[PDB]
Design a binder for this molecule. Structure first.
Ligand SMILES: NC(=O)c1ccc[n+]([C@@H]2O[C@H](COP(=O)([O-])OP(=O)(O)OC[C@H]3O[C@@H](n4cnc5c(N)ncnc54)[C@H](O)[C@@H]3O)[C@@H](O)[C@H]2O)c1
Ligand SMILES: NC(=O)c1ccc[n+]([C@@H]2O[C@H](COP(=O)([O-])OP(=O)(O)OC[C@H]3O[C@@H](n4cnc5c(N)ncnc54)[C@H](O)[C@@H]3O)[C@@H](O)[C@H]2O)c1
Lengths: 308, 307
C-alpha cells in the first residue's frame, strides 16, 4: 500500500484529490501539503504538513520521514496570476518542478504532475488538439507546463522515473476563490442561485474543453493505478466535453427558465481563451488505459445546481 | 555601433564570433567572456572578462558597466557531457538562460541564443524539419533548448525583449578540441596525416551540417536584420546535409587513398537517429534573406588548407 504526498493541495483540486485518495488508501496514508493555512475541516480530514516547493531541502525530509511513494504535484501559479508575476511563476513552476523531479528520482516515488489546455499555442491544432502536436504557448504558465511534460518524459527515459501526466481541461467544481479564464463556468452556478442573473466575461460562443471535478480526479487515480506496460506515452489529453457560455446558459435554463445572462468581455482573458484549443482529443487515453468520462453538460449542470 | 558581450565564448564558436564581430563593430566593442582561463593569443585579441552564467549579480554588473546592448549567449553543456551530469547541465542551461533573459529584458539588450538540431525528437518531422513542428527531444540539452525557444519568444510577446534565435546544425571548424557530430572534425586531422579514420556513426546516417563561417555570418545577419522583417523569432539555419560515406567521397577528390572503418558507438548513434536529417530554412531565406556559402565540395577544400 502506497504513502501519498499531495503538493499544493489547498487549491481548487487538491482537497477533492485528498478525499478520493484517502478513501482508496486510508486516511493516514495521504499527506496533504501547501504553504497556506488549511480550513479547520480539511486539517482534521487527515495528516497535513507545511511544504514550500521552492525549498528542496524540506521535500527530502518530508519524503524520507513519511516514507512517501506516490506524489501528486499540484502546486503552481496558474495563467491568472502567472502573467502578472512572471518571476515568481517561473520559480514556483520550473524550479519547483525540478525539485519534485529530483526528490522523486532519488527516493523512488511515482510522480503525477498535471498539464493543461494552456500548454498549447495559436500555432497548435484547436479542433481538436491531439496529444502530439505543435506546442508554442505564449503564457509563462503554459511554457512551464510544456517544460513539465518534456522534463518528466526525459526523466522517464534517462532514469526509470515513473512519471505520469494528464492534460486537464478547465475543471468545474462546486465551491471554488476566483480565477481564471475558465472561471465563468464555476461562478455562473453561484449567481444562478443568488439572483438569477450572471455577468459573463468571455464571448457567448468561446468553445473550451471542460470537465467536472469527479472525472478529473477519477482519471488521475486511474492512470496512476494503471499497469505501466499499457502506457504507450506518459502525457495524455483527458476529455469530457466542450461548450460555450451560450450552451451552458441553455442547460441552466432547462432547470431555471428565468435565468438571465449578460456579457462584458475581458480582452486579457478573451485573448488567452482564443489561444487555447476548443476540443481535446483523448483517443490515446481511452485506448491505452480505460478512460471514460461520467459527466457531460446535462449531468454536470444537475450536480452543480444540487450544491445550492 | 553596438557594445557586445559573448557569453561562454571560449568553446568552438565564441572565438570565431569574437573575430567576426570585432572586424565589423570594433575590437574594443566586443567583450569575450567565460569561466575558463583564456589562451594567451585569445586574451590579447580584445577585452576579456570572467563571467559565470550562474551568477546573476555578476551579469548585471558586466552589462551595466560595459554598457552592453548586444548579447550572444553561447554558454552551455552540450548533448554528450550533459547526459553524464544532468543536475549541472540543468543549472547552466536553464537557470543560466533565466539569468541571461532577466538581464537582457531589464537593460534593453538585443539577445541572441542559439538553438540546435538537438531541439527535435523521434516524434518530429526529420526530412526535412520545418520551423514549426512537434518538438519532443529525449536529451536534457534538447529539453533545455526547447525551453530556450519558448521562454525567449514569451519574453518577446510579454515584454519588449528583442530575442533572436537560430537552430544550428552540427558546426564544423578546423580549430576544435567528444560530441555526436564530432566525427566530421576529427576526420580531417586524420585525413591529411593519411589515411584511415575510424568513424563512430553508421555509413548512411544523415545529419544537417554547416561550416563555421556560414554559422557566424547568419548569427550576425539575423541580428542586423530589421525587426519588422521577422515573422518569427526562431529560425532553422541550413546549408548542407551528409552521411559519413558522402564525406569520405568528397575527400577523395583531394586524397583518393582515403578509407573508413565504421566502429559505431551506439550511444551517439541512437541520438543521431533522434535528430532530423535535413533542416528547412524557407523562412530564414524569405524573411531576413539568408543564403549559405559553403556546400560539401568547398567545405572539404577549406578544411584541408588548415593541414
Ligand atoms: N483547476 C483547473 O481547472 C486546472 C486546469 C488545468 C490544469 N490544472 C493543474 O492542476 C494543478 C492543481 O490545480 P489547482 O487549480 O488546484 O491550482 P490552484 O491555483 O487552485 O492551487 C495551487 C496551489 O499551489 C500552492 N502553491 C503556490 N506556491 C507554492 C509553493 N512554493 N509551495 C507549495 N505550494 C504552493 C497554492 O497555495 C495553491 O493552494 C495545477 O498544476 C494546475 O496547473 C488545473
Ligand atoms: N558547435 C555546435 O556544433 C553547435 C550546434 C548547435 C548549437 N550550438 C550552440 O552554440 C553555442 C556555442 O557552442 P560551442 O560549440 O561553443 O559549445 P562549447 O561546449 O564549445 O562551449 C560552451 C562554453 O560555455 C562555457 N560555460 C559552461 N558553463 C558555464 C557557466 N556556468 N558560465 C559561463 N560559461 C560557461 C564553457 O566553458 C564553454 O567554453 C551553444 O549555446 C550551443 O548550444 C552549437
Amino acid at each position: 500500500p502506497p504513502r501519498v504526498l499531495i503538493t499544493g493541495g489547498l487549491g481548487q483540486l487538491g482537497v477533492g484529490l485528498a478525499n478520493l485518495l484517502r478513501k482508496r488508501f486510508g486516511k493516514d496514508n495521504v499527506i496533504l501539503s501547501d504553504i497556506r493555512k488549511p480550513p479547520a475541516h480539511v486539517f482534521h480530514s487527515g495528516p497535513f504538513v507545511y511544504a514550500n516547493i521552492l525549498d528542496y531541502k524540506s521535500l527530502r525530509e518530508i519524503v524520507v520521514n513519511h516514507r512517501i511513494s506516490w506524489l501528486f504535484h499540484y502546486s503552481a501559479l496558474l495563467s491568472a496570476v502567472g502573467e502578472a508575476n512572471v518571476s515568481l511563476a517561473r520559480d514556483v513552476n520550473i524550479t519547483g518542478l525540478h525539485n519534485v523531479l529530483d526528490v522523486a528520482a532519488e527516493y523512488n516515488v511515482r510522480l503525477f504532475v498535471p498539464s493543461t489546455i494552456g500548454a498549447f499555442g495559436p500555432t497548435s491544432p484547436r479542433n481538436p488538439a491531439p496529444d502530439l502536436c505543435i506546442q508554442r504557448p505564449r503564457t509563462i504558465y503554459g511554457v512551464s507546463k510544456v517544460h513539465t511534460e518534456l522534463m518528466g518524459e526525459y526523466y522517464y527515459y534517462r532514469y526509470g522515473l515513473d512519471f505520469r501526466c494528464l492534460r486537464y481541461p478547465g475543471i468545474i467544481s462546486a465551491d471554488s476563490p476566483g480565477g481564471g479564464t475558465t472561471d465563468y463556468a464555476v461562478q455562473i452556478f453561484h449567481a444562478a442561485a443568488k439572483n438569477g442573473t450572471f455577468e459573463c466575461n468571455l464571448e457567448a460562443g468561446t468553445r473550451l474543453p471542460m470537465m467536472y471535478i469527479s472525472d478529473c480526479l477519477r482519471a488521475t487515480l486511474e492512470v496512476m493505478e494503471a499497469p505501466a506496460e499499457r502506457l504507450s506515452m506518459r502525457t495524455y489529453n483527458i476529455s469530457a466535453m466542450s461548450f460555450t457560455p451560450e450552451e451552458l446558459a441553455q442547460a441552466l435554463r432547462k432547470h431555471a427558465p428565468d435565468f438571465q445572462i449578460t456579457y462584458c468581455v475581458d480582452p486579457l482573458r478573451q485573448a488567452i481563451a482564443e489561444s487555447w484549443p476548443m476540443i481535446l482529443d483523448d483517443s490515446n487515453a481511452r485506448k491505452d488505459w480505460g478512460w471514460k468520462h461520467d459527466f457531460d453538460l446535462p449531468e454536470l449542470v444537475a450536480t452543480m445546481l444540487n450544491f445550492h
